[PDB]
Amino acid sequence: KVFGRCELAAAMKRHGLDNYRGYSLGNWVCAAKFESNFNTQATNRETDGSTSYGILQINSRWWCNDGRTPGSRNLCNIPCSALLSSDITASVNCAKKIVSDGNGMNAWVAWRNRCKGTDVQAWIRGCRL
Ligand SMILES: [Cl-]
Ligand SMILES: [Cl-]
Ligand SMILES: [Cl-]
Ligand SMILES: [Cl-]
Ligand SMILES: [Cl-]
């Protein structure tokens, strides 16, 4: 599923991400835009041979199991393929664990490089929320 910007904002808000660990909704929408282009089916191999999955590009090195990332963990207790669903529940729940892990949203490289410090509120402008 390719989410609309506001559609995703509304879903993320419903799931409790707005100001979760102090991160306003626009941060999460911005992260999803640059991680997956709002596409739940997005998969990308990373430099370390791990793979990132879904709307928020949850990564197989620590967070989900894909059966092909050596030495990895599965801290969200989920197959990575289950993070490609049109239903964002599993990704959101895993994201809540990640963002509570100590380094906040810096865990998402694309957030650090493209969203952090920017006018992220622009990402929810126009949305009925
Ligand atoms: Cl957009
Ligand atoms: Cl915001
Ligand atoms: Cl593995
Ligand atoms: Cl599995
Ligand atoms: Cl933080």
From which experimental method does this structure derive? Answer: X-ray
Resolution of the coordinates, Å: 1.5
| Residue 6, φ and ψ in degrees, nearest 5 | -70, -35
Ligand 5 centroid–CA 125 distance in Å is: 23
45 CA to centre of ligand 3 in angstroms? 14
Phi, psi of 115 (to 5 degrees): -120, -40
Give how many domains the chain has, as a whole number: 1
Look at the chain and count its residues. 129
Residue given tokens 């370390």 in the structure block: 48
Alpha-carbon distance of 121 to 74, in angstroms, equals: 32
Distance 2 CA to ligand 1 centre (A): 11
CATH classification at residue 29: 1.10.530.10
- List all residues 6 or more positions away from 63 whose beta carbon is below 8 Å from its beta carbon: 73, 74, 75, 76, 94, 97, 98
Contact predicate 57/36, CB 8 Å: yes
Range of the domain at 81: 1-129
Dist. CA 95 → ligand 4 center (Å): 18
- Kindly calculate the radius of gyration of the chain based on its CA atoms and give it in whole angstroms: 14
Cβ atoms of 26 and 122 closer than 8 Å: yes
Burial class (CB in 10 A: 0-12, 13-18, 19+), 90: buried
Residue with tokens 């191999």, as numbered in its chain: 45
